[PDB]
């Protein structure tokens, strides 16, 4: 079969026939803005490339059909990428995020393999028949590292090298080739990083590299050319095509580059999600980010409890574990602006306020099942904060424009408004359905108040009026009986019992702009927008205040998620049939349902339904 050379340049991907006359023809793609890294799947006649200007990784057939963006979230500088043709896995290295990741070639089951002690990985090469992957690290002390293709047993192969590119494996001869972008030469070694040799040393600006049969191919940005030489001696040089500046990558397309066999090539190793090569020609099963490998070492369990954090245009998920597993960004299309978040642990649906379109949306964490719970016709609404009554299946939300607390069912049907006052400015809100109360900040002019009312708007009381400037965020823990708030002006986090007793200041130093709070197990997490940090404090008092993650920009909300106990959930009196209440079921006194109505309706004689 014929051998072809593919090179990327600017926004085009071109194919050069080596065995015939050099014939330059572009791959008929569309919508490419800056093509950088290249690979191919010999089975599918499929080409793969990263795009540094769109921060995506895409694939298509050589004829341009079936254009597919397989990675589109959470990339910064994806300058390294390789196709695992035995396991059908896509690998990539992101120089910006300092991550080496993997997924199926169609994009499913994305997972992070290398993230700790990793500084700017750039060039990536795979040996799935052996279980090893190799990559060049630029930032800091540059080096060429090696790991198993599941990320395990990372080791440094070549520690004394400059920044390197074109990591290429000569599988037939068991040799590594790379260009050194700082010493400006081309060298090679065996697979252990030993028996090093310099292939060509007189080149001004050698950038890209590939290998084929008896030859290496390189591109030189100063010579503006693609060239071929003897892979062992560097002589027998010829120019393949000149007058090509800023060729981002070159690659030989032929079946002999993708050969061999491992246990993933058959039935995906009977692995449910990911089949990942490890030495020596064996494999292990892998799972999407934050999933757990089950007891059989074949199937995967989704995470039951986690933390969700929001920024301006992304919502992220982190978990606490013994891998210190990295946070990931949820692949939610139709997310433009987030200002606040909440989660329904019954249907596993994530909810958020979009302040650009002034809506409340919901979707699965895989992006699907997008739905708009609250929307304004093209007067004007402006949601500010939200809190979900998981038992009554309601969202309690604040509207900045109209200064009301409104209630909407998760299917979008309006329940009604439970707070409206001339002077009222309800902004932050968290509901306590277990005890029939909601807690909200009332940013009235000159008198910011923390208030409580019944879930039907009655039994209104001011909890705190002094010591407040901008109470901007609430959280609560019904188990411990505590309420929490952050003041973004006074730069502190305070706590008090749900009754309004025992108010203490938990943290008041080294905080700039606290904008959110959540409770996870025995810890209180918060987010500092100005300091770009997530921090936590042990509410038992044992462990000191701890930094969780830093340099996170545009932080907006934080929200803990606990695995919902279904037996306990079904025991709440409003959980089944809303206690027979047409609109509002609230727990009062001796744990019994009492029905109530929004402020535009009045309870009917049956005392279960609401009327005019």
């Amino acid at each position: 079969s014929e051998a072809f050379l593919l090179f990327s340049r600017r926004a085009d991907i071109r194919r050069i026939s080596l065995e015939t006359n050099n014939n330059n023809v572009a791959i008929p793609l569309t919508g490419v803005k800056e093509a950088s890294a290249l690979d191919f799947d010999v089975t599918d006649n499929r080409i793969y490339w990263t795009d540094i200007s769109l921060k995506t990784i895409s694939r298509a057939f050589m004829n341009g059909s079936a254009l597919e963006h397989v990675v589109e979230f959470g990339l910064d500088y994806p300058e390294g990428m390789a196709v695992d043709w035995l396991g059908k896995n896509l690998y990539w290295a992101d120089t910006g995020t300092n991550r080496i990741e993997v997924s199926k070639l169609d994009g499913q089951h994305r997972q992070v393999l290398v993230w700790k002690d990793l500084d700017s990985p750039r060039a990536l090469a795979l040996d799935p028949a052996e279980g090893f992957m190799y990559w060049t690290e630029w930032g800091g002390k540059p080096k060429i590292d090696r790991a198993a293709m599941d990320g395990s047993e990372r080791t440094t192969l070549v520690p004394n090298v400059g920044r390197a590119n074109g990591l290429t494996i000569d599988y037939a001869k068991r040799r590594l080739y790379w260009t050194d972008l700082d010493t400006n030469l081309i060298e090679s070694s065996n697979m252990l990083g030993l028996n090093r040799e310099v292939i060509a040393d007189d080149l001004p600006h050698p950038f890209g590299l590939t290998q084929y049969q008896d030859y290496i191919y390189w591109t030189d940005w100063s010579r503006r050319s693609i060239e071929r030489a003897n892979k062992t001696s560097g002589q027998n040089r010829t120019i393949i095509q000149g007058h090509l500046d800023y060729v981002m990558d070159i690659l030989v397309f032929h079946s002999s580059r993708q050969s061999g066999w491992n246990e993933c090539a058959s039935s995906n190793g009977h692995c449910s999600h990911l089949c990942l090569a490890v030495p020596v020609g064996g494999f292990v099963c892998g799972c999407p980010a934050h999933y757990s490998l089950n007891a059989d070492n074949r199937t995967c369990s989704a995470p039951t409890t986690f933390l969700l954090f929001s920024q301006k245009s992304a919502i992220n998920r982190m978990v606490i574990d013994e891998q210190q597993s990295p946070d990931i960004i949820l692949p939610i299309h139709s997310l433009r602006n987030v200002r606040a978040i909440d989660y329904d642990p019954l249907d596993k649906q994530l909810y958020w306020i979009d302040s650009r379109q002034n809506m409340i949306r919901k979707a699965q964490e895989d992006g699907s099942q997008g739905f708009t719970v609250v929307v304004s016709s093209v007067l004007e609404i402006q949601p500010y904060d939200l809190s979900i009554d998981i038992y009554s299946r309601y969202i309690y939300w604040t509207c900045e424009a109209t200064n009301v607390i409104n209630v909407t069912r998760l299917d979008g049907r309006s329940v009604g408004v439970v707070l409206k006052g001339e002077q009222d400015r309800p902004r932050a809100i968290v509901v306590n359905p277990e005890k029939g109360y909601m807690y909200f900040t009332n940013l009235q002019e000159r008198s910011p108040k923390i208030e409580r009312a019944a879930l039907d708007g009655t039994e209104r009381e001011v909890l705190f009026f002094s010591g407040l400037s901008k109470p901007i965020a609430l959280a609560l823990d019904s188990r411990l009986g505590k309420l929490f708030w952050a003041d973004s002006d006074l730069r502190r986090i305070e706590s008090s019992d749900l009754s309004g007793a025992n108010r203490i200041v938990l943290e008041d130093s080294n905080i700039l702009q606290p904008v959110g709070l959540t409770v996870f197990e025995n810890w209180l997490y918060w987010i500092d927008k100005q300091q770009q940090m997530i921090e936590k404090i042990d509410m038992t008092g044992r462990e000191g205040r701890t930094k969780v993650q830093a340099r996170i920009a545009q932080l907006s909300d934080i929200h803990a998620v606990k695995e919902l106990n279904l037996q306990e959930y079904r025991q709440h009196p409003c959980a089944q049939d809303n206690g027979g209440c047409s609109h509002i079921c609230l727990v009062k006194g001796d744990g019994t349902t009492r029905c109530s109505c929004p402020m535009h309706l009045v309870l009917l004689q049956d005392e279960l339904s609401c009327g005019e």
Partner: protein, 32 residues
């Protein structure tokens, strides 16, 4: 788009005769 090429330019631009270790280095003009 030149996001990738710009990042590479600023990562190796100081490796140029013009730069006498007193260079922020010239602005990127090779987009396009």
């Amino acid at each position: 788009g030149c996001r990738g090429l710009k990042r590479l330019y600023e990562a190796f631009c100081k490796q140029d005769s013009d730069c006498l270790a007193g260079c922020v280095c010239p602005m990127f003009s090779e987009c396009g």
